[PDB]
Write a protein that binds this ligand. Structure first.
Ligand SMILES: Nc1ncnc2c1ncn2[C@@H]1O[C@H](COP(=O)(O)O)[C@@H](O)[C@H]1O
Ligand SMILES: O=P(O)(O)OC[C@H]1O[C@@H](O)[C@H](O)[C@@H]1O
Ligand SMILES: [Mg+2]
Ligand SMILES: [Mg+2]
Lengths: 19, 284, 431, 48, 48
């Protein structure tokens, strides 16, 4: 499951917080 | 194999019965006669205006379109409105009546429809996405690509599922419109202390993926919807998991829906989802 | 001796009153022809005796416009007459849908469906609602309940068959006469033109919905759905639909079921629409490696090779409806031999029960019936962690009471361990 | 372990805020800082 | 030294059984002095 997690993490900027 | 079947680039033709018009029908045209480069002399569109639009609300432009400048950001009552079209040629103004002409083709109907502003109605759509995950935490994978998941609302007017979004109000930008439309439609009432800050964390990283022309059935020859699509992606999935989806305003039900190419959504939202999956190398 | 009085349950749900048979049965109507709308009172009700079957099955011919609550009262009155007032109320309504035409299933798969369905039926005292005709999945369901009627004494769970009157062999024979017809002989092989569809001899009760048409299918789905919903509200029990094989109309039936919140159990490997639904659910939800090559194109190809639509738009509509059915993963439970196991069909039924809308105490009672302690432990631990302690304390007494009543000692120990005082028990009724 | 790889300080702050419910942000910050200061030395804390 | 909640709380039976078994063995094997708050509520009452 550790390997499953590892291989998973291995695979016009706008900021709309004002709303 | 086939023999040059199913054209070259199948253009958009709006449906015959205009929505919410009480059975008023447009002038039917074939898809090979739609573009404005083609002459098409047998064209007699119908001029129809909705009573709601003709009652003059706050979000509606005046009935006489004279002195209004198109293709640029124009100030109406001191509030900025962005009348820029995403078409490379631009918007052309008819000399006889002063009405704008749709550069994306004929729609078989002149005049101002259900849309309040002459010319380009800028709409903002908000695609809030997360990776579709199993209970074990592993990302779902189809066709060798990671699978996305987006928030979809069921529209009040025509009961078809769609991406949350709406028209840009006067004096406001796409940022406010996107956030306001997502809270109003997908969330309804609006957000609990840090949970609200978490939502702000969700809203601090948005990318404009496309600015395209909508295949919206309310479009006419003098008023058409053009959309800016903003994607809010939750890579970790922490911020997305705290959202309590509950339909409000002009939406009946809201739910998380798996993204694929066979989706039957309102207007040209499949093209928008295609652009999102193209940018994030996701399944479609 | 023909019955003259019946115990009909009150609208308050507190007791049954004795009333005359002609007075109660006057409220059901039948249509002599298609043109007729108001109709005339039903002269077709009684009991049918089938060859090689010891018990007789009641039948009622009722109109499409008739109230399903009245039909529900009729079924309750028959059960109350046969098994006494304190008969075992159903905690589960099992709706069986699928293929009208005959089909053959693999022996291992058939054995698995039979074992799971028999256990579920005997543990929950379930009402099985099918189409009632002697073909396909209804005939198959009859074969699974025949062994229940042979191997078990005292209470027998009803197998209600709801069928359209216009296609049934022997309708004229059942209609003619003075009601009730006590022990009427049914001749399934007799040629009653134009009907070629006989009634299944293993169904314990029959509701013949009549609309005046002849040789027309599909008239009974809405009344059947309304009857299942009415029964579900009346006994405060969840309704679970089971989909085995099935044609194009089965997809719309399943779509209606998932739209109304009713969970479905799709038997994978039975072929046709069930395989389509299972493929769609596995494509959209299953995280295993062998479903990673599943694609919507192959699903479209499977639908096209199986159902063979005339037009592309029909294929698109069927595919869209199939994808719309399996949108909510809780409401669809897919049973597969190579994934779950031979003795895991009742576990799939319990998974459908827990995924449905109901109170936790009721869900704990259902978990107690199927003898799945681990499920009860996980549910209690999850409820304890999520701050739902009040509902645990509110339902622990009734759950402990149910555990003592149904002879489940492990459950008795479990409920007593979560701070439930033994001397604070309260009776269900009022003395 | 793998199941603690998704643990973050933000979720810890959220857990402290939902559990203790502080009046001020500075109080929440002080509680979080004190909690992180407790488990600095791995030998002195044993979690059962 | 046993510290914790002054107010009353309910623990899961498996967890309570585990704490009870470990604490009883530790106390009987080391002849340990157990120091609590002494009041009849919460973890002190539980330790009692
Ligand atoms: N340019 C606009 N065109 C049409 N509707 C607008 C516009 N600006 C704001 N609105 C409002 O947004 C609503 C969205 O459409 P609807 O889905 O009908 O509720 C409209 O009914 C108007 O109240
Ligand atoms: O303003 P409402 O009706 O809420 O939504 C406008 C929709 O019209 C479409 O072109 C846009 O994609 C947008 O989703
Ligand atoms: Mg909207
Ligand atoms: Mg809107």
């Amino acid at each position: 499951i550790s390997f499953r997690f590892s291989l998973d993490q291995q695979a016009n900027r706008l900021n709309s917080a004002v709303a | 194999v086939h023999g040059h079947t199913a054209e070259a680039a199948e253009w958009y033709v709006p449906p015959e019965e205009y929505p919410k018009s009480g059975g008023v029908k447009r002038y039917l045209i074939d898809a090979s006669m739609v573009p404005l480069s083609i002459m098409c002399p047998s064209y007699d569109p119908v001029e129809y205006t909705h009573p709601s639009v003709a009652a003059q609300p706050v979000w509606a432009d005046p009935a006489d379109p004279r002195k209004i400048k198109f293709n640029v950001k124009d100030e109406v009552n001191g509030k900025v409105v962005d009348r820029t079209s995403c078409h490379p040629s631009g918007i052309s103004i008819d000399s006889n009546t002063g009405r704008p002409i749709n550069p994306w083709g004929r729609t078989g109907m002149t005049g101002r429809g259900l849309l309040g502003k002459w010319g380009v109605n800028q709409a903002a759509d908000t695609v809030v996405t997360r990776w579709k995950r199993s209970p074990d935490g592993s990302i779902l994978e189809r066709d060798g690509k990671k699978v996305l998941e987006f928030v979809a609302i069921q529209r009040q007017d025509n009961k078809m599922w769609a991406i949350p979004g709406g028209f840009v109000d006067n004096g406001e930008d796409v940022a406010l419109t996107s956030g306001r439309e997502f809270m109003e439609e997908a969330l309804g009432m609006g957000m609990s202390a840090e949970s609200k800050d978490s939502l702000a964390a969700l809203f601090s990283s948005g990318t404009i993926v496309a600015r395209i022309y909508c295949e919206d059935p309310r479009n006419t020859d003098n008023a058409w919807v053009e959309t800016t699509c903003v994607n809010f992606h939750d890579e970790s999935g922490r911020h997305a998991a705290r959202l309590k989806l509950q339909g409000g305003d002009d939406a009946e039900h809201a739910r998380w829906m798996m993204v694929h190419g066979g989706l039957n959504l309102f207007a040209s939202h499949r093209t928008l989802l295609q652009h999102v999956t193209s940018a994030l190398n996701a399944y479609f | 001796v023909a019955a003259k009085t019946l115990l009909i349950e009150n609208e308050d749900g507190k007791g049954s009153t004795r009333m005359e048979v002609q007075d109660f049965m006057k409220r059901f109507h039948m249509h002599a022809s298609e043109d007729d709308k108001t109709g005339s009172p039903s002269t077709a009700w009684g009991t049918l005796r089938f060859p090689t079957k010891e018990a007789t099955a009641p039948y009622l011919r009722l109109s499409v416009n008739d109230d399903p609550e009245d039909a529900l009262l009729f079924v309750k009155a028959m059960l109350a007459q046969k098994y006494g007032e304190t008969y075992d109320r159903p905690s589960l309504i099992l709706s069986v849908t699928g293929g009208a035409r005959n089909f053959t299933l693999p022996p291992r798969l058939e054995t698995a469906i039979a074992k799971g369905l028999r256990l579920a039926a005997q543990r929950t005292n379930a009402w099985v609602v099918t189409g009632g005709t002697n073909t396909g999945v209804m005939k198959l369901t009859g074969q699974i309940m025949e062994a229940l009627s042979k191997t078990q004494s005292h209470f027998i769970p009803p197998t209600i068959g709801i069928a359209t009157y216009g296609v049934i062999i022997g309708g004229d024979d059942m209609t003619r006469g003075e009601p009730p017809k006590i022990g009427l002989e049914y001749e399934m092989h007799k040629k009653d033109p134009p009907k070629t569809t006989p009634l299944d001899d293993n169904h314990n009760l029959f509701l013949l919905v009549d609309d005046g048409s002849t040789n027309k299918f599909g008239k009974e789905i809405k009344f059947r759905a309304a009857f299942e919903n009415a029964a579900g509200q009346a006994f405060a029990a969840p309704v679970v639909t089971i989909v085995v094989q099935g044609g194009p109309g089965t997809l719309g039936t399943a779509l209606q079921a998932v739209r109304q919140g009713t969970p479905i159990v799709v038997v994978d490997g039975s072929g046709l629409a069930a395989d389509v639904l299972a493929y769609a659910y596995n494509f959209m939800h299953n995280p295993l490696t062998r479903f990673k090559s599943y694609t919507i194109d192959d699903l479209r190809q499977k639908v096209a090779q199986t159902f063979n639509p005339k037009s592309s738009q029909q294929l698109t509509n069927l595919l869209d409806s199939a994808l719309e059915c399996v949108q909510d993963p809780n409401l669809v439970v897919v049973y597969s031999l190579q994934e779950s196991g031979i003795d895991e069909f009742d576990d799939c039924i319990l998974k459908a029960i827990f995924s449905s809308q109901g109170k936790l105490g009721n869900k704990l009672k259902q978990a107690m019936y199927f003898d799945q302690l681990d499920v009860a432990k996980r549910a209690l631990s999850e409820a304890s962690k999520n701050g739902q302690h009040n509902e645990i304390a509110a339902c622990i007494n009734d759950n402990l009471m149910a555990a003592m009543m149904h002879n489940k000692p492990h459950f008795v120990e479990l409920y007593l361990g979560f701070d439930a005082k033994i001397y604070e028990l309260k009776p269900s009724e009022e003395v």
